[PDB]
Amino acid sequence: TQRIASHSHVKGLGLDESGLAKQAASGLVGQENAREACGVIVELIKSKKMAGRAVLLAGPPGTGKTALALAIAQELGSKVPFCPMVGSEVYSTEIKKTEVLMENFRRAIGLRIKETKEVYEGEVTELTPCETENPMGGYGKTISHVIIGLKTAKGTKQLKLDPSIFESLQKERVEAGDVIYIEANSGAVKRQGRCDTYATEFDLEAEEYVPLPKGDVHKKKEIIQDVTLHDLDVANARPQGGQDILSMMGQLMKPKKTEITDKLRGEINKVVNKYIDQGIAELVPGVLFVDEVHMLDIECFTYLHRALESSIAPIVIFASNRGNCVIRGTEDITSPHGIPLDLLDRVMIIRTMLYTPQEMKQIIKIRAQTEGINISEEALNHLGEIGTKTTLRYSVQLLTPANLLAKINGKDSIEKEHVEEISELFYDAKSSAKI
Amino acid sequence: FEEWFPQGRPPKVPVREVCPVTHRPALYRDPVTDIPYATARAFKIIREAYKKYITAHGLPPTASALGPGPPPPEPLPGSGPRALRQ
Amino acid sequence: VTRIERIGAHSHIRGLGLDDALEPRQASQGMVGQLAARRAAGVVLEMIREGKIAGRAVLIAGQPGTGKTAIAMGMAQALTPFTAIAGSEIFSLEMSKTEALTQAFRRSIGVRIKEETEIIEGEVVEIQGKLTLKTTEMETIYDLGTKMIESLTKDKVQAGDVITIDKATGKISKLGRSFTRARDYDAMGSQTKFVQCPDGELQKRKEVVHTVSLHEIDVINSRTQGFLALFSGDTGEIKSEVREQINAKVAEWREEGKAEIIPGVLFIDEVHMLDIESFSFLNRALESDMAPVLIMATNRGITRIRGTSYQSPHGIPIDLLDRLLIVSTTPYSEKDTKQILRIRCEEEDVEMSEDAYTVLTRIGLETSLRYAIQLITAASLVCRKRKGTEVQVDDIKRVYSLFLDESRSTQYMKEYQ
Amino acid sequence: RIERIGAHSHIRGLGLDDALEPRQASQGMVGQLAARRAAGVVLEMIREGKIAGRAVLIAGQPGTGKTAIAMGMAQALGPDTPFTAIAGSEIFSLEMSKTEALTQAFRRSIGVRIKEETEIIEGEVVEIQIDRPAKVGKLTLKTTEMETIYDLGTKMIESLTKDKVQAGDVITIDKATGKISKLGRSFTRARDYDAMGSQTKFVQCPDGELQKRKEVVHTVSLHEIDVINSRTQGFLALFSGDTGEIKSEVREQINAKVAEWREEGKAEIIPGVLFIDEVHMLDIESFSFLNRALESDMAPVLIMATNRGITRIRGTSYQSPHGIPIDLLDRLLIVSTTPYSEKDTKQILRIRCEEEDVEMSEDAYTVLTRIGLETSLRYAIQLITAASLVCRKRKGTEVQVDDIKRVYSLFLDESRSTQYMKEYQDA
């Protein structure tokens, strides 16, 4: 299911090799200076040299601030994490605002952790070659080595493992004919189950028979797991393993999202650095796109302009849509963009001008193309004219309903009559203001 | 030494049973006749053959069903060691 | 016989009566008047059915009593997940507005999941070490492993029990013995109810489709799942567990065909009471991929937005107004009023005279329409008291004199207590 | 090692001389000799710790380096002394009152160095022969100068069986509890097993057979109260903030036992610092609490920063300087930060460039100092980064005037944003 979203045509900033801006910029049109600033900041992000830097996508409504935000996000690629957040999500009834902001900052930061493990598997043929008793002591019966005949699909390879592991072999039901999961360093044996070759159709049992391993006995499984710092925080927050945690009444209330700074910073950062400099993981700072930043309370901005001061804070892309308005939580304290004047000094303002009527027509045409419906020249011109009259977002919403009206009327392309009828069936707020 | 190391022979890979009435991979095992089967028609034919056998000392003929190109043996000697139903 | 659901405030409308070409009729499925609004409702309904796009919101405007909620209920009945809520439902003490609104959005989307597994079922004849499973058309013996042996004892399986066992050693004793019920004359256990012996092949694969909404985040929320699915459930709903796990799993199931999504409709009646926070959140939530079609209703014109001293059309921010298709309704006329009153009387099993209908329409024009809709049943009950077979003008006049309307009520408030 | 440079990474201490004389440029700081000397003397007082309950308020215009001098003091204080940095809006918690959060923050910046006498036996296990009944065992520890064999007990044998210790393992066994702690290996394992390959650790101490009085100083903050409030404390010490513990029998008892330890020589108190950035966000109740909470003997040094003059106190209507009530404002002493001049701005920009490893021409430095003196300093650093990126994209070696001038138009300042804002986008 394609499930076309509101604005999915944006695929990237579409900047030329020289870094300038063009019209057909991979879905997004116009906004030359804004897209160039987006390119500069995405180059910054890719550099991964600076932290705690914020940028403000100030601009009137309809300038496609969220559009260019998703464009730069896609340009960054799925490699680096991108956590979208709206100012309303900060208001939580169970966890304070600043801690939600810190959790979002952590989510915005990524971390790839590699893990290589040398493991041996295959059908076992246990046999202990009798050896003279310990030569340092007396005589008797001892075992200096324990040979395990691991048989894999590719062949057979006997391993003369250490004799001390014999306890593990006897611990689990390791009988001749089952698949075992050996570990190089640890040596612990974990039986996977009997081989399917012995799973007679008349034997009723499940989870006990497994297929033979494909490949050499010695396998060096390399696996990479990308988890944000917030994932590690949550994992180390709650407990696991016994301790009467199975209770329902006094424990089912899992929403204990409350978090402290000691655990968040400190030990977690240190272990992350140890994994980084040791070669076990690679840090991947992402981006935190915060739209409707003006909706945050002053208690949120006062914590933002302090968290951005930290060396670990990721890149934040604020997108304020309102203009000069009183800061929330303050007594008639008017500030530009609804953001305190102190935080605006820490953010780079990327201004976005209004779309030219030609840009409106281009946007309408590319949205119609993405939708997959053909529109005649006259219909497209009428759509552009009405998008110039009222908000541009009204025109793009008139494509699908006009398309369905055309399809039901027996015609394929959206004729001017269809859009004309839809404009009278549906209209915008500017016309609805006539109460 | 014997307890911690039960040096037993391999698991003696079992037989790949086959349905005697249709020659397909047997999916079931008739209880009274103790011969594998895979379909309801096969079960009915096996029950009829077992009834004919238990009727007399031993069924002289052998029931035939779904004879492929090569000469089908029509297996009577697929001895069912199980006794009477009840 | 009286049932749970009965004639109510919006039960007369069986649906959004429209033609094949979305040409609204005069009155077919109980609904009358509002031709343009009806055609807009049909267009948005066809858009919903198509499911080609996501993140589309429609605002139903008009004066009070213009049939906005009526059109919404008609579209819902003609529309298949549907979620109708109010601005006060999302306001929860243990869940922030954003969390409740996200839960509603995800619950407004449906998801069908096809499950295919191997099943073995039959009457147990005798066990042991080995099972002897019987069915109507055959019988089979099975060797029991350690896990199967343990399950045969932890659950008191015995002869005659119609057992069921799929893969993963998930045994089930659905119901008790078939024939042995005879000797259980007096008492019969609570769980030991009886069933008919199954037929057909013993081992059979069954394909079943599980229909669940995208709100399954609660299922993968805590260690126990079924518990939270009845009451409020969990309140946290961590963003990670919601987006990075459920959305990706649904996308993978769609790719491999294991599951298919069906976007529903989210009808938020009386959206004017929402706070600026909810509107700001919606501004982004409507931009997501798995966003359902949103419908709203509001009776406000130029009013203040709750939570701020600002005023805007429909009592909501301008940022969102640029994202909605406004479908304003038109007040009913004499003929439309009389026709809707006729429909209401026919649905409520009330018979009235022509003069009675004329007086009722005159009242509904001088006063609100719901007032006349209630006068219908009031005069019907008055006539029943008088034992008459049809409601006359005298009954409606007596009721008009008994029950007061907003206008007359306010006019008679001169006492001022 | 992978940690990006932040806004206050250029500073790496508070440049001071033997006589506390401030220097022009050192340790990443520039100018502001008065406030820097105040920071130095308050840091000396902190490191002294003889007096409790002292407060200092860092006031000044935005961009004067309040958070800068705060981080400089934090760095100069160095480890072994807690420095709890917190924002004024972090005390507002939905599971603990403001006063409770302030108590947590105060007790979190106080440390107690707990002395503990240990007796650890270490060496190389030459023989770990154990006789399992399925009871008897002997351990042969070897050092570079002596050897000794120890008869193992049942519980000690079980503990050794828990943590697998093969011959040649470097272990440090605590004679008090018998905890098995493996440090490494002295040689390979028979060169024959086709697994378990690792590196060999250096030999043990010659006298490692029996270390008598190994002194280990366990340092912990006064936040240990979380260890007592609930039977399970890890949940509260790690994530859970719902720690509305009982003040009686917890605070008083812990303080009494800490005093007893200090008197008996077990532990020593090391008061830290509590830095509340943008303290003006605190409610008047929080200020009233700080007024009294700052009088206890366990009160840390309370450093605060305000970026306002006459402003209303949150939670009330009347106004007071710095948004702080007259009482607390008069109690503390204020350290005013004078704005930076053109030379100081240029030097700070150069230090930042050196930190970012970016180079630019002299004309670039001049024009950027001009722009920073006009708009702001932080905006000048933003332009530094933007111009460095534009130069990297341009394939150049250093940032010239044409890159700073380009990024000046590409990225706007609030002063120009509000100018272009006359389009009445919204209100």
Ligand SMILES: Nc1ncnc2c1ncn2[C@@H]1O[C@H](COP(=O)(O)OP(=O)(O)O)[C@@H](O)[C@H]1O
């Ligand atoms: N340059 C552009 N090219 C194509 N479509 C655009 C462009 N700018 C905006 N749009 C359209 O505008 C709609 C929403 O824009 P958005 O990013 O929400 O701006 P705002 O958040 O200010 O309303 C999207 O559906 C997108 O299709």
Ligand SMILES: Nc1ncnc2c1ncn2[C@@H]1O[C@H](COP(=O)(O)OP(=O)(O)O)[C@@H](O)[C@H]1O
């Ligand atoms: N066109 C119509 N067809 C049928 N019933 C109608 C129609 N218009 C209004 N009604 C009746 O009007 C009553 C109240 O209208 P209501 O839906 O509350 O108005 P609003 O849409 O402003 O909330 C309902 O009980 C409904 O039965």
Ligand SMILES: Nc1ncnc2c1ncn2[C@@H]1O[C@H](COP(=O)(O)OP(=O)(O)O)[C@@H](O)[C@H]1O
């Ligand atoms: N003395 C200084 N040396 C270097 N940078 C400074 C100095 N003072 C202020 N800054 C810079 O100005 C910006 C904000 O000033 P800051 O240090 O936070 O002081 P304040 O807290 O008064 O704003 C920061 O990016 C910081 O790097």
